Amino acid sequence: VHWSAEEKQLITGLWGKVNVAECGAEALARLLIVYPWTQRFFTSFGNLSSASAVLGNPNVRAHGKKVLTSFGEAVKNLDNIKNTFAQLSELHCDKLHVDPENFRLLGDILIIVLAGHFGKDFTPDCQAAWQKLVRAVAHALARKYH
Amino acid sequence: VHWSAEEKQLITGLWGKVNVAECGAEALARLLIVYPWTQRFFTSFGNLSSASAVLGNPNVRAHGKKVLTSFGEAVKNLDNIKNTFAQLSELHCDKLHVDPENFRLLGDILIIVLAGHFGKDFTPDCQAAWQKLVRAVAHALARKYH
Amino acid sequence: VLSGTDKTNVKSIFSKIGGQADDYGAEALERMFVTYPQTKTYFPHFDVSPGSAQVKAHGKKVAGGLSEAANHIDDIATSLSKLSDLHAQKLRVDPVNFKLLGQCFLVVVAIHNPSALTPEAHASLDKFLCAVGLVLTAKYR
Amino acid sequence: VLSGTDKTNVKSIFSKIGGQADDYGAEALERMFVTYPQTKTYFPHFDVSPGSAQVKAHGKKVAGGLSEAANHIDDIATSLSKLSDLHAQKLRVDPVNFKLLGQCFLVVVAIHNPSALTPEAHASLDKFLCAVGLVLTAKYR
Ligand code: HEM
Ligand code: HEM
Ligand code: HEM
Ligand code: HEM
């Protein structure tokens, strides 16, 4: 992807204020609850199966935070988005066999998270930059599907 | 994508026997009929709207043949699949605004075409190589979506 | 196909976002046109610039259908039956497009009402929105 | 939601591919496992090598459901009601996966019967197949 000067501002200025532990856990919990088939990938986490089970699981909070930090690395590198997710691509594709379409589902849900959390400061322009990024990252995990 | 020696054989050996004018017209007619929303992109072609209208349209035959020849260029270049669809990507993305998901719909329909036409010689291995290609090309028109 | 628990849950959020429907309808399309520029192919007769009163006038009727479909959540397909021709028969809308608007629609409720959109509501609303997008794309199947 | 014209069109192809259902069921999964290796995640208890009799034994019941759903094309959801738990509730199958099998299923009918699969049949069959994949993924909505 090619990024504008004014695009990096909206993205970087907003990352600056995000609580990764809070959102990390929102993002992941919502995914598990809105798309219940994503559940089978996380069986090692003990009980899922009910909204409240999902919410009160310590793994969901810890994993969630890791996922978001990952998006961190994208904010940082903006030009180098491949190469930075290469090893992570092998893992999601080669070992786990997560169909790429779920990477989109996690991107969209992330925008709802940042949307609810930032209120009016999630302007339309900003939401457009954020989509461009969430799509760039999702594309950069697809990679190992050749 | 990375291609094996034995993979190029199945692909190249099979291209060798394909009637582009016949299939070209099958591929495109089926697309227009099975996914009737693809119709709006082709309004310059005069009447679509009914299976038989679609079938007896001279544009559908002529356009269809052009589409397939295009896949030709992929058979030829196997390693260089981007760069070869770059100008074509700009056209589908920038000018027309065809959502990429329809490029998948055209790939799948193409496999049914080659399937019906070749019978038993469309072995499972071969159908796997053909999918790897139809997906590589579809990916190589996505390109201009950044 | 919409359980009793999703229903008394979608009836609930629409009586809380009731008298704001309309404004969320304006902002929804506006976000769509900015974040998904392709969607403007369909509205060439409109003024699409940030601010337009056509866009305001249009969003007031998109909310309309939504509010309505919620009033008749047991029979959503008779409720919306004239709208399914417009979108599928006449205007021939790519189905991927119903996801995009709905997605934009959730962004707006989360902006103005962070606490109506709990994880669970998010679930009920998300299946209600693309049971609405299935009635509007029905004649393709 | 399945017109009278699609129906007397899907009832038609299934009485022509009738006594071959079973063999097309074996070959369908086999092609799926080769062209979409990911689908093997779900069947780890099986021998999946080209030729297996588990794979033959399994394909005979996947045809089963199909043939059946066609016998009761007015009520496909009562016809297949126990199968919707297995796939959605217990085994938790990615929905993208129903497209892949159906796609493989068309490849096989086109191989063995190039002339049943006219453009139009291809249309009726294609909406019948992913009205079947909607009954089996129903509890996610
Ligand atoms: C789209 C953005 C995503 C990012 C940035 C991301 C990132 C990560 C990270 C940082 C880890 C942990 C690193 C490690 O332990 O080596 C991980 C592991 C994992 N991810 Fe993802 N992920 C994403 C999407 C998904 C999706 C959609 C799924 C499927 C529902 C998924 C399933 C998993 C699983 C099952 C693990 C391993 C869990 C374990 O070892 O217990 N991820 N991912
Ligand atoms: C996925 C493989 C595809 C290939 C290889 C392909 C290739 C081509 C070629 C060779 C042309 C004509 C070249 C020219 O006149 O400059 C063309 C034009 C066009 N294509 Fe595609 N195409 C593909 C998919 C699609 C899809 C899915 C759609 C949308 C339903 C589409 C819509 C169009 C349209 C509307 C034109 C211009 C027609 C005109 O000028 O009258 N194509 N494409
Ligand atoms: C999400 C659910 C949607 C609802 C409830 C909805 C509702 C409506 C309504 C109420 C009308 C005008 C009806 C009248 O006065 O006769 C309309 C027209 C229209 N819709 Fe939708 N719509 C939806 C999604 C979409 C999407 C996703 C698109 C494509 C981007 C689209 C494209 C159009 C166009 C081009 C018109 C006609 C413009 C005009 O009448 O001036 N709609 N829609
Ligand atoms: C396309 C329509 C499908 C039909 C009609 C179908 C049918 C069936 C039937 C009849 C059974 C065994 C029922 C019994 O004896 O109780 C079964 C089990 C199963 N299905 Fe499906 N299936 C379909 C699609 C899929 C797909 C796409 C997947 C995922 C790749 C899948 C995964 C499984 C698994 C893992 C089992 C259990 C294995 C076993 O019982 O030994 N199914 N299915």
Coordinates of N, CA and C in Angstrom, one line a residue, chain D:
Chain D
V1 N -35.9 -17.4 -2.7 CA -36.0 -18.5 -1.6 C -36.4 -19.8 -2.2
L2 N -36.2 -20.0 -3.5 CA -36.4 -21.2 -4.3 C -37.8 -21.2 -5.0
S3 N -37.8 -20.7 -6.2 CA -39.0 -20.5 -7.0 C -39.4 -21.8 -7.6
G4 N -40.6 -21.9 -8.1 CA -41.2 -23.1 -8.7 C -40.4 -23.6 -9.9
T5 N -39.7 -22.7 -10.6 CA -38.9 -23.0 -11.8 C -37.6 -23.6 -11.4
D6 N -36.9 -23.1 -10.4 CA -35.7 -23.8 -9.8 C -36.1 -25.2 -9.3
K7 N -37.2 -25.3 -8.6 CA -37.6 -26.7 -8.1 C -37.8 -27.7 -9.2
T8 N -38.7 -27.5 -10.1 CA -38.9 -28.5 -11.2 C -37.7 -28.3 -12.2
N9 N -36.5 -28.6 -11.7 CA -35.3 -28.3 -12.4 C -34.2 -28.9 -11.5
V10 N -34.3 -28.8 -10.2 CA -33.5 -29.6 -9.2 C -34.1 -31.0 -8.9
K11 N -35.4 -31.1 -8.9 CA -36.1 -32.4 -8.8 C -35.6 -33.2 -10.1
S12 N -35.6 -32.6 -11.2 CA -35.1 -33.1 -12.5 C -33.7 -33.6 -12.5
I13 N -32.7 -32.8 -12.0 CA -31.3 -33.3 -12.1 C -31.0 -34.4 -11.2
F14 N -31.7 -34.5 -10.0 CA -31.5 -35.5 -9.1 C -32.1 -36.9 -9.4
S15 N -33.0 -36.9 -10.4 CA -33.6 -38.2 -10.9 C -32.7 -38.7 -12.1
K16 N -31.9 -37.8 -12.6 CA -31.0 -38.2 -13.6 C -29.6 -38.6 -13.1
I17 N -29.2 -38.0 -11.9 CA -27.9 -38.4 -11.3 C -28.2 -39.3 -10.1
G18 N -29.4 -39.9 -10.1 CA -29.9 -40.7 -9.0 C -29.0 -41.8 -8.5
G19 N -28.9 -42.9 -9.2 CA -28.1 -44.1 -8.8 C -26.6 -43.9 -8.9
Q20 N -26.2 -42.6 -9.1 CA -24.7 -42.4 -9.0 C -24.3 -41.4 -7.9
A21 N -25.3 -40.9 -7.2 CA -25.2 -40.0 -6.1 C -24.0 -40.4 -5.3
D22 N -24.1 -41.6 -4.7 CA -23.1 -42.2 -3.8 C -21.6 -42.1 -4.4
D23 N -21.4 -42.5 -5.6 CA -20.0 -42.4 -6.2 C -19.6 -41.0 -6.3
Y24 N -20.5 -40.1 -6.6 CA -20.1 -38.6 -6.7 C -19.9 -38.1 -5.3
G25 N -20.5 -38.6 -4.3 CA -20.2 -38.3 -2.9 C -18.8 -38.7 -2.5
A26 N -18.4 -39.9 -2.8 CA -17.0 -40.3 -2.5 C -16.1 -39.3 -3.2
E27 N -16.2 -39.1 -4.6 CA -15.2 -38.3 -5.3 C -15.2 -36.8 -4.9
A28 N -16.4 -36.3 -4.5 CA -16.5 -35.0 -4.0 C -15.5 -34.7 -2.8
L29 N -15.6 -35.4 -1.7 CA -14.7 -35.2 -0.6 C -13.3 -35.3 -1.0
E30 N -13.0 -36.4 -1.8 CA -11.6 -36.7 -2.3 C -11.0 -35.5 -3.0
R31 N -11.7 -34.9 -4.0 CA -11.3 -33.7 -4.6 C -11.2 -32.5 -3.6
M32 N -12.1 -32.3 -2.7 CA -12.0 -31.3 -1.6 C -10.7 -31.5 -0.8
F33 N -10.3 -32.7 -0.4 CA -9.1 -32.9 0.4 C -7.8 -32.6 -0.3
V34 N -7.9 -32.8 -1.6 CA -6.7 -32.6 -2.5 C -6.6 -31.1 -2.8
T35 N -7.7 -30.4 -3.1 CA -7.7 -29.0 -3.6 C -7.7 -28.0 -2.5
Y36 N -8.3 -28.4 -1.4 CA -8.4 -27.6 -0.2 C -7.9 -28.4 1.1
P37 N -6.6 -28.5 1.2 CA -5.9 -29.5 2.2 C -6.4 -29.1 3.6
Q38 N -6.8 -27.9 3.8 CA -7.2 -27.4 5.1 C -8.5 -28.1 5.6
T39 N -9.3 -28.6 4.7 CA -10.5 -29.3 5.1 C -10.3 -30.5 5.9
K40 N -9.0 -31.1 5.8 CA -8.6 -32.3 6.6 C -8.4 -32.1 8.1
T41 N -8.3 -30.8 8.6 CA -8.3 -30.5 10.0 C -9.5 -31.2 10.7
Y42 N -10.7 -31.2 10.0 CA -11.9 -31.7 10.6 C -12.0 -33.2 10.7
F43 N -11.4 -33.9 9.8 CA -11.4 -35.3 9.8 C -10.1 -35.9 10.2
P44 N -9.6 -35.8 11.5 CA -8.3 -36.3 11.9 C -8.4 -37.8 12.2
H45 N -9.6 -38.3 12.4 CA -9.7 -39.7 12.8 C -9.8 -40.6 11.6
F46 N -9.9 -40.0 10.4 CA -10.0 -40.7 9.1 C -8.6 -41.1 8.5
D47 N -8.6 -42.2 7.7 CA -7.6 -42.3 6.7 C -8.0 -41.5 5.5
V48 N -7.1 -40.6 5.1 CA -7.5 -39.6 4.1 C -6.7 -39.8 2.7
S49 N -5.9 -40.8 2.7 CA -5.1 -41.1 1.5 C -6.0 -41.5 0.4
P50 N -5.7 -41.0 -0.9 CA -6.5 -41.3 -2.1 C -6.9 -42.8 -2.2
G51 N -8.1 -43.1 -2.1 CA -8.5 -44.5 -2.1 C -9.3 -44.9 -0.9
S52 N -9.1 -44.3 0.3 CA -9.7 -44.8 1.5 C -11.2 -45.2 1.5
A53 N -11.5 -46.2 2.2 CA -12.9 -46.7 2.4 C -13.7 -46.0 3.4
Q54 N -13.0 -45.3 4.3 CA -13.7 -44.4 5.2 C -14.2 -43.2 4.4
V55 N -13.4 -42.7 3.5 CA -13.7 -41.6 2.5 C -14.9 -42.0 1.6
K56 N -14.8 -43.3 1.1 CA -15.9 -43.9 0.4 C -17.2 -44.0 1.2
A57 N -17.0 -44.5 2.5 CA -18.1 -44.7 3.4 C -18.7 -43.3 3.8
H58 N -17.8 -42.3 3.9 CA -18.4 -41.0 4.3 C -19.2 -40.4 3.2
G59 N -18.6 -40.4 1.9 CA -19.3 -39.8 0.8 C -20.7 -40.3 0.5
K60 N -20.9 -41.6 0.8 CA -22.2 -42.3 0.7 C -23.2 -41.7 1.6
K61 N -22.8 -41.1 2.7 CA -23.8 -40.4 3.6 C -24.0 -38.9 3.2
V62 N -22.9 -38.2 2.8 CA -23.0 -36.8 2.3 C -24.0 -36.8 1.0
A63 N -23.9 -37.7 0.1 CA -24.9 -37.9 -1.0 C -26.2 -38.1 -0.4
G64 N -26.4 -39.0 0.6 CA -27.6 -39.2 1.4 C -28.4 -38.0 1.7
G65 N -27.9 -37.1 2.5 CA -28.5 -35.8 2.8 C -28.9 -35.0 1.6
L66 N -28.1 -35.0 0.6 CA -28.4 -34.2 -0.6 C -29.6 -34.8 -1.3
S67 N -29.6 -36.0 -1.6 CA -30.7 -36.8 -2.2 C -32.0 -36.5 -1.4
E68 N -31.9 -36.6 -0.1 CA -33.0 -36.4 0.8 C -33.5 -35.0 0.7
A69 N -32.6 -34.0 0.9 CA -33.0 -32.6 0.9 C -33.8 -32.3 -0.4
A70 N -33.4 -33.0 -1.5 CA -34.1 -32.8 -2.8 C -35.5 -33.4 -2.8
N71 N -35.7 -34.6 -2.1 CA -37.1 -35.2 -1.9 C -38.0 -34.3 -1.1
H72 N -37.5 -33.4 -0.3 CA -38.3 -32.5 0.5 C -38.0 -31.1 0.3
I73 N -37.9 -30.7 -0.9 CA -37.4 -29.3 -1.3 C -38.3 -28.2 -0.8
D74 N -39.5 -28.5 -0.4 CA -40.4 -27.5 0.2 C -40.1 -27.3 1.7
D75 N -39.5 -28.3 2.4 CA -39.2 -28.2 3.8 C -37.7 -28.7 4.2
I76 N -36.7 -28.1 3.5 CA -35.3 -28.6 3.6 C -34.8 -28.5 5.1
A77 N -35.3 -27.7 5.9 CA -34.8 -27.5 7.3 C -35.3 -28.5 8.3
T78 N -36.5 -29.2 8.1 CA -36.9 -30.3 8.9 C -36.3 -31.6 8.5
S79 N -36.1 -31.6 7.2 CA -35.4 -32.7 6.5 C -34.0 -32.9 7.0
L80 N -33.3 -31.8 7.2 CA -31.9 -31.9 7.6 C -31.6 -31.5 9.1
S81 N -32.7 -31.4 9.9 CA -32.6 -30.7 11.2 C -31.5 -31.3 12.2
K82 N -31.3 -32.6 12.2 CA -30.2 -33.1 13.1 C -28.8 -32.8 12.6
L83 N -28.6 -32.8 11.3 CA -27.3 -32.4 10.7 C -26.9 -30.9 11.0
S84 N -27.8 -30.0 11.3 CA -27.4 -28.6 11.6 C -26.7 -28.5 13.0
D85 N -27.0 -29.3 13.9 CA -26.3 -29.3 15.2 C -24.9 -29.9 15.1
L86 N -24.8 -31.1 14.5 CA -23.5 -31.7 14.3 C -22.5 -30.6 13.7
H87 N -22.9 -29.9 12.7 CA -21.9 -29.1 12.0 C -21.7 -27.7 12.6
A88 N -22.7 -27.1 13.2 CA -22.7 -25.8 13.8 C -22.4 -25.8 15.3
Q89 N -23.2 -26.7 16.1 CA -23.1 -26.8 17.5 C -21.9 -27.6 18.0
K90 N -21.8 -28.9 17.6 CA -20.7 -29.8 18.0 C -19.3 -29.5 17.3
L91 N -19.3 -29.6 16.0 CA -18.0 -29.7 15.3 C -17.5 -28.3 14.9
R92 N -18.3 -27.3 15.1 CA -18.0 -25.9 14.8 C -17.3 -25.5 13.5
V93 N -17.9 -25.9 12.4 CA -17.3 -25.8 11.0 C -17.3 -24.4 10.4
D94 N -16.1 -23.8 10.0 CA -16.1 -22.5 9.3 C -17.1 -22.5 8.1
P95 N -18.0 -21.5 8.0 CA -19.0 -21.5 6.9 C -18.5 -21.4 5.5
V96 N -17.3 -20.7 5.3 CA -16.6 -20.7 4.0 C -16.5 -22.2 3.5
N97 N -16.6 -23.1 4.4 CA -16.3 -24.5 4.0 C -17.4 -25.1 3.2
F98 N -18.7 -24.6 3.4 CA -19.8 -25.2 2.6 C -19.7 -24.9 1.1
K99 N -19.3 -23.7 0.7 CA -18.9 -23.3 -0.7 C -17.9 -24.3 -1.3
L100 N -16.9 -24.6 -0.5 CA -15.8 -25.4 -1.1 C -16.3 -26.8 -1.6
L101 N -17.1 -27.5 -0.7 CA -17.6 -28.8 -1.0 C -18.6 -28.8 -2.2
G102 N -19.5 -27.8 -2.1 CA -20.5 -27.6 -3.2 C -19.8 -27.3 -4.5
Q103 N -18.7 -26.5 -4.5 CA -17.9 -26.2 -5.7 C -17.4 -27.5 -6.2
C104 N -16.8 -28.4 -5.3 CA -16.3 -29.7 -5.7 C -17.3 -30.6 -6.2
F105 N -18.5 -30.5 -5.6 CA -19.7 -31.2 -6.1 C -20.1 -30.9 -7.5
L106 N -20.2 -29.7 -7.9 CA -20.4 -29.3 -9.3 C -19.3 -29.8 -10.2
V107 N -18.1 -29.7 -9.9 CA -17.0 -30.2 -10.7 C -17.2 -31.7 -11.2
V108 N -17.7 -32.5 -10.2 CA -17.9 -33.9 -10.4 C -19.1 -34.2 -11.3
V109 N -20.2 -33.5 -11.1 CA -21.4 -33.6 -12.1 C -21.0 -33.2 -13.5
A110 N -20.2 -32.1 -13.6 CA -19.8 -31.7 -14.9 C -18.8 -32.7 -15.6
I111 N -18.1 -33.4 -14.8 CA -17.2 -34.4 -15.3 C -17.9 -35.6 -15.9
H112 N -18.8 -36.2 -15.1 CA -19.5 -37.4 -15.5 C -20.8 -37.2 -16.3
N113 N -21.3 -35.9 -16.4 CA -22.6 -35.6 -17.0 C -22.6 -34.2 -17.6
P114 N -21.8 -33.9 -18.6 CA -21.5 -32.5 -19.1 C -22.7 -31.8 -19.5
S115 N -23.7 -32.6 -19.9 CA -24.9 -32.1 -20.5 C -26.1 -32.0 -19.6
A116 N -26.1 -32.5 -18.4 CA -27.1 -32.2 -17.4 C -26.9 -30.7 -16.9
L117 N -25.6 -30.3 -16.8 CA -25.2 -29.1 -16.3 C -25.1 -27.9 -17.3
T118 N -26.3 -27.7 -18.0 CA -26.5 -26.5 -18.8 C -26.2 -25.2 -18.0
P119 N -25.9 -24.1 -18.6 CA -26.0 -22.8 -17.8 C -27.2 -22.7 -16.8
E120 N -28.4 -22.9 -17.2 CA -29.6 -22.8 -16.3 C -29.6 -23.8 -15.1
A121 N -29.4 -25.1 -15.4 CA -29.3 -26.1 -14.3 C -28.2 -25.7 -13.3
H122 N -27.1 -25.2 -13.9 CA -26.0 -24.7 -13.1 C -26.5 -23.7 -12.1
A123 N -27.5 -22.9 -12.6 CA -28.0 -21.8 -11.8 C -28.9 -22.4 -10.7
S124 N -29.9 -23.3 -11.0 CA -30.8 -23.9 -10.1 C -30.0 -24.7 -9.0
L125 N -29.0 -25.4 -9.5 CA -28.2 -26.3 -8.6 C -27.4 -25.5 -7.7
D126 N -26.9 -24.3 -8.2 CA -26.1 -23.5 -7.4 C -26.8 -22.8 -6.2
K127 N -28.1 -22.4 -6.5 CA -28.9 -21.9 -5.3 C -29.4 -23.0 -4.4
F128 N -29.8 -24.2 -4.9 CA -30.1 -25.3 -4.1 C -29.0 -25.7 -3.1
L129 N -27.7 -25.9 -3.6 CA -26.5 -26.2 -2.8 C -26.2 -25.2 -1.7
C130 N -26.4 -23.9 -1.9 CA -26.2 -23.0 -0.8 C -27.5 -22.5 -0.3
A131 N -28.6 -23.3 -0.4 CA -29.7 -23.2 0.6 C -29.6 -24.4 1.5
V132 N -28.9 -25.5 1.0 CA -28.5 -26.6 1.9 C -27.4 -26.2 2.9
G133 N -26.4 -25.4 2.4 CA -25.4 -24.9 3.3 C -25.9 -23.8 4.3
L134 N -27.1 -23.4 4.1 CA -27.6 -22.4 5.1 C -28.4 -23.1 6.2
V135 N -29.0 -24.2 5.9 CA -29.7 -25.0 6.9 C -28.6 -25.6 7.8
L136 N -27.4 -25.9 7.3 CA -26.4 -26.6 8.1 C -25.6 -25.6 8.9
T137 N -25.7 -24.3 8.6 CA -25.0 -23.3 9.3 C -25.9 -22.4 10.1
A138 N -27.2 -22.9 10.3 CA -28.3 -22.0 10.7 C -28.2 -21.4 12.1
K139 N -27.8 -22.3 13.1 CA -27.6 -21.8 14.5 C -26.5 -20.7 14.7
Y140 N -25.7 -20.4 13.7 CA -24.8 -19.2 13.8 C -25.6 -17.9 13.6
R141 N -26.9 -18.0 13.2 CA -27.9 -16.9 13.0 C -29.3 -17.2 13.6

